[PDB]
Each structure stands twice: as structure tokens, then as C-alpha cells.
């Protein structure tokens, strides 16, 4: 797995490159209050750790509705 | 009677040379047109230790004269060969240690090694550590050169026969006492199964001619004839004289 | 043995397949009276391929 | 309490290829991970000194920029050996 | 030996002692002249003065 280089890379892949699902895990264990958006491209699983939940929402809108979005 | 140890040793099997992990056969550069009319030039890539030989062996790279590549030749190393030395092989090679020239060109009194016994033999004479042949005389009329072999014998060779100038390195190797049976074991492992040696007086009468009685004695003269058969030849072969006496 | 050859595995296989008692129905069909394979083997006592 | 890892390899004989290092898995058990023998990085044809720039990975998995050095004779010769050859070639021509 | 060398290097680097004095004290340290750092430090003060 790898860490996506910001939302610019995340959404560029989600707009045109291979993408299957963007899973939004939320604050597991309260180690962090951030939300983790994870995209499964054919090659790797790319994760964006978003400090603010509101910031994640705008990034999720950027992901095409063709990409499946799941929330956990 | 059992086939004696000398009889068994010639049948190959376990008494063969331990030739594994050995550099190769040390020989002179093949006689060629540029060695007959001219001198080829080679750089000493590496001075290396052969497994069974005390003398060091040097890998000298020569240009390929029949191609675009380079030819690697393994030679006995004359003392003073250094990494990067430009050795020369040929009729017009200069008189410097490590150069190979025909012995007729070589002046008298010179110390040479790896001399060719016959023209174009790739070298057969002084090859052991510290050994050397001496150019004694040139007979121009017969095109033959007398050399003094390491045993002090003198032989007439062809003037064409080629030799490498210099004593072969590793000299004084035999001066150090082996000290322990161990050191002999190590040295003989590298060479062949010839150690340890059991005296035949120690053996049974079936195993050896010297055999075994009640008092551990040869019981007949150790001196054996030259025409003795393979089992019989075990003592001093065709001894012209025997005993420790001063002279010569 | 864990690293068995195929040829060896197939010869040993037949021995397990043929290590079977006479079927009871075959004894009734043939009226055998004697009821034992004899060619049957036991792993501890048998020395197959020896 | 009993960290006896057992054997990851097909045979127990511990040759140079069969070496294992132990870590902890996410499931709290000791694990055996094969330690691969690091390949030597290329060496100078003259000098025999590890050429700089190329990492000690099989060159099959390296990529061309990482398995090459940007200089004439970049991999075969070191920058001192190559400088020596440049000097001798020019100087021998003068004489 | 490591403890004595560590102090000597710092003193040379801080210019508390000269490099010639450091060499003389480093050879004496190798020769077992100084049993403990306090003896070295005392000798260094005496040599300086």
C-alpha cells in the first residue's frame, strides 16, 4: 500500500486513472480524530488521511460518482 | 601377496592429483608469427597462488593476434613480476626479467626459467620455486645452446627454444621446517594422497617385500636391480653407491 | 518420503488399493470357504520394495 | 513463553541462503522472515573498488538509471582509473 | 581508554588544550598513566599551568 500525495493526486486518479472504491474509515480508537479515505487502484491501495471531516466531504465530491464510495 | 602400495598408486583412483580449484597449466605464450618476427606486449593482471604449487603463478594478458579480443596467459612468476608490468614475448623482446626470448638471443650467464626442452614446447624446465637454468654457451654452427639444468646437469637445447628471464619466485620455501605433522597434512592435501608414509618393515610379509619378521628388518640388501619387476622394485633402485660419505 | 517421486507414489498407491479383504459377496459367489486375502500387508511388518 | 519458531525452509540445514530473522506479527506470534544474501555492488575492472552510484540489489530489479553511472566507462572503470586511461592515451600519442 | 579519549578530544576541540598537548596526553593515556578521568583532568590542569 502507499500514501496518496494529497487530494490532487487522489482526485486525478479518481477522475481518470483506474479506481474501484474510496472507503472512508472514521477516527478508529480516537488515536486521531481524522478520517482516512482509501482508494483501491489496480496497482495499490492509496490512503489520504484528512484532518477535518468537512475537508473529506469536498474531496469525496471530487471523486467521480463512477467510483464506489463506502463509509465506515 | 597383495598388490603393493606403489602398484595400487598407478591405477589412478584415490592416488590421483587433487587438481580441484587449481588455476590451470602454467605455460609460455604459444609461438606465433609476431613472436617469430617481432615482440608481443602483455600486462601482468594478477600474481596468484596455485593450489598445489609453492611457486606463485602470474596471469599476463596479451592482445589477440588472430582477433579483436584479448588473450589471458598463466605463467610461472619470475621473482620481481609486479601488477602492471609490461612483459614482452618474442624474438626481439628486450633482456628484462619476465620477458620471454629464444635462448640463443639470451646472453650467457643469464638466469632463466620455464625453458622449453624442445622448440615450441610451451616450457618444461625450471618451473619449481627458486629454481633457475643458466645459459652456459651458444654453439652457433649447430644452432644449439647449452644450459645448466637445476640438478647441475648440462643439456644442449635448440637456440630457438624460448625461456623467461629470472629466478622463479617462492625461493627459500623449503628452508622453514614443516615443524608439525599438521603442516605436512595441509601441504599434501593440496597435492595428492601420498602421506602419511608407512615403512614396509612395519607391514606384514604379504603387504610388502621388506615384509615383517620377529625383529622388523629388511633381511636382504635394500639395493634392488634396474630390471626388477613392478612388485620387487621397493628398495634403493639401481644404486651406483650407498651410505653417507663426503665428496663430489 | 514427503518428497516422493510420482512413479514411486503410484506403485505404493496400488499396494494400498489391493490391501483389501475378500468381499463377503465374492466368498458367497465362489463358495471360497477359506476367507483371507494373504496378499494383504501391514505397514509395520511388511517390507514393500525390499 | 515458548518462542520456538520452527523452520520456514524446506530443509532444516542452515546454509548461507537459509537464514531467518524474527519479528512479531500483528497476531502476536514470533515469525521467521528469510534474510536474502545481499548481492555485492559492481566492482572496478582496475582497482577492484565498489563502483559508486549503483545499489547492492540484483541488477534485474534495479532500473536503467540506478544500474548505470553517468560517465564514459561509468560502470567498468572508476573516475580515477578512467582519468588515468584518458591521460595515458593522450600522452602516448604525443610520443 | 574511551572515557579518557572522549575528554581529551573535547578539550582539544574547545581549545582548552593544544593539539600537541592532546597528542602527549593521548599517548600517556594509552600507556596507563591515568587510572581515572579525575587523574587525567588534574594532570591536564597541571600541564596547562
Amino acid at each position: 500500500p502507499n500514501t496518496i500525495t494529497e487530494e490532487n493526486l487522489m482526485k486525478m486518479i479518481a477522475d481518470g486513472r483506474g479506481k474501484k472504491l474510496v472507503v472512508k474509515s472514521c477516527s478508529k480508537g480516537r488515536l486521531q480524530g481524522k478520517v482516512k479515505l482509501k482508494l483501491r487502484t489496480a496497482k495499490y491501495l492509496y490512503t489520504l488521511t484528512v484532518p477535518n471531516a468537512d475537508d473529506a466531504k469536498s474531496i469525496v465530491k471530487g471523486c467521480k460518482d463512477k467510483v464506489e464510495v463506502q463509509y465506515v | 601377496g597383495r598388490r603393493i602400495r606403489v602398484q595400487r598408486k598407478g591405477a589412478g583412483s584415490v592416488f590421483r592429483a587433487h587438481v580441484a580449484r587449481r588455476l590451470g597449466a602454467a605455460k609460455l605464450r604459444a609461438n606465433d608469427f609476431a613472436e617469430r618476427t617481432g615482440s608481443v606486449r602483455g600486462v601482468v593482471k594478477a600474481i596468484l597462488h596455485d593450489r598445489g604449487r609453492g611457486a606463485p603463478l602470474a596471469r599476463v594478458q596479451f592482445p589477440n593476434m588472430r582477433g579483436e579480443g584479448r588473450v589471458n596467459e598463466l605463467f610461472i612468476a619470475p621473482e620481481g613480476m609486479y601488477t602492471g608490468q609490461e612483459v614482452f614475448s618474442g624474438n626481439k623482446a628486450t633482456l628484462h626479467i619476465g620477458n620471454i626470448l629464444p635462448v640463443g638471443n639470451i646472453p650467457e650467464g643469464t638466469y632463466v626459467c620455464n625453458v622449453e626442452e624442445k622448440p615450441m614446447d610451451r616450457g618444461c624446465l625450471a618451473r619449481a620455486s627458486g629454481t633457475y637454468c643458466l645459459v652456459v654457451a651458444h654453439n652457433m654452427e649447430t644452432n644449439k645452446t647449452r644450459i645448466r639444468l637445476p640438478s647441475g646437469q648440462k643439456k644442449l637445447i635448440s637456440s630457438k627454444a624460448r625461456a623467461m628471464i629470472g629466478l622463479v619466485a617462492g625461493g627459500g620455501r623449503t628452508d622453514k621446517p614443516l615443524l608439525k605433522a599438521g603442516n605436512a597434512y595441509h601441504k599434501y592435501k593440496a597435492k595428492r594422497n601420498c602421506w602419511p608414509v608407512v615403512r614396509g618393515v612395519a607391514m606384514n610379509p604379504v603387504d610388502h617385500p621388506h615384509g615383517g619378521g620377529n625383529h622388523q628388518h629388511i633381511g636382504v640388501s635394500s639395493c634392488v636391480p634396474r630390471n626388477a619387476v613392478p612388485g620387487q622394485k621397493v628398495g634403493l633402485i639401481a644404486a651406483r653407491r650407498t651410505g653417507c660419505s663426503g665428496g663430489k | 518420503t514427503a518428497n516422493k517421486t510420482l512413479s514411486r507414489k503410484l506403485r505404493l498407491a496400488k499396494k494400498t488399493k489391493t490391501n483389501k479383504n475378500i468381499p463377503r459377496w465374492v466368498i458367497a459367489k465362489d463358495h471360497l470357504k477359506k476367507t483371507w486375502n494373504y496378499k494383504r500387508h501391514h505397514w509395520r511388518r511388511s517390507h514393500l520394495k525390499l | 513463553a515458548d518462542c520456538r519458531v520452527t523452520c520456514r525452509f524446506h530443509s532444516t540445514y542452515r546454509t548461507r541462503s537459509k537464514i531467518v530473522r524474527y519479528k512479531r506479527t500483528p497476531g502476536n506470534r514470533l515469525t521467521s522472515l528469510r534474510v536474502k544474501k545481499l548481492p555485492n555492488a559492481p566492482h572496478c575492472a582496475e582497482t577492484g573498488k565498489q563502483i559508486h552510484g549503483i545499489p547492492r540489489v540484483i541488477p534485474q530489479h534495479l532500473t536503467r538509471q540506478q544500474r548505470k553511472v553517468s560517465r564514459p566507462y561509468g560502470g567498468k572503470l572508476c573516475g580515477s582509473a578512467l582519468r588515468a586511461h584518458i591521460l595515458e592515451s593522450f600522452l602516448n600519442e604525443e610520443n | 581508554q574511551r572515557v579518557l579519549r572522549r575528554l581529551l578530544s573535547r578539550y582539544r576541540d574547545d581549545e582548552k588544550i593544544d593539539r600537541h598537548l592532546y597528542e602527549t596526553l593521548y599517548a600517556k593515556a594509552k600507556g596507563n598513566m591515568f587510572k581515572n578521568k579525575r587523574v587525567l583532568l588534574e594532570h591536564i590542569v597541571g600541564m596547562q599551568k
Binding site: - | 600474481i47 606463485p56 621473482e79 626479467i97 625461493g171 627459500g172 620455501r173 621446517p177 615443524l179 | - | - | -
Partner: protein, 90 residues
């Protein structure tokens, strides 16, 4: 600090091997482990890799030599002959 009065590096062999062998070895093994002056880089760094093989630690030059001494006495005499005889021809 003089650990042994007479036997030198031969103290390794203890009381075994005799006196004559230990005296010869003292001289032979002092030469074998001695640092010789590099004929090329003029630095006393030459050490014996193998019998007949001596390598300068600093020079990096490997030289063919006597088994226990970089230069054997016969070989020095041979070198002087060849140099004189070569000069006689030219």
C-alpha cells in the same frame, strides 16, 4: 615488559618441536611477518599475502618474491647480472 628473554615469536610453540627448529623458525617467521619497503611507492607497507606473493598495503602493487622475504639473495644477484648483460648488448 620483556615477556620472554630468548624465544621470540617461537613462544607460541611452547616446549615442543625442539630447540634447533624453533631457532630456524625465529629467523624465518620474523622475515615472513616483516614489513618491507615498497619498490614502487617507497613505503614500508609490503606484507606477505601468500608464499611468493607480497602486496603493498598503500601502493596496492602485488609483487612476485621469495617465500619468506620480499627479495631473495639469489634473485638480487640475478637482477644485477641481467642489468649488466643487457647494458653490455646496448
Amino acid at each position: 615488559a620483556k615477556r620472554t628473554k630468548k624465544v621470540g615469536l617461537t613462544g607460541k610453540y611452547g616446549t615442543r618441536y625442539g630447540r634447533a627448529a624453533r631457532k630456524q623458525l625465529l629467523k624465518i617467521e620474523t622475515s615472513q611477518k616483516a614489513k618491507y619497503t615498497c619498490p614502487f611507492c617507497a613505503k614500508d607497507k609490503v606484507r606477505r599475502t601468500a608464499c611468493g606473493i607480497w602486496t603493498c598495503r598503500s601502493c596496492s602493487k602485488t609483487m612476485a618474491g621469495g617465500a619468506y622475504s620480499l627479495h631473495t639473495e639469489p634473485a638480487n644477484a640475478a637482477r644485477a647480472t641481467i642489468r649488466r648483460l643487457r647494458l653490455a648488448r646496448e
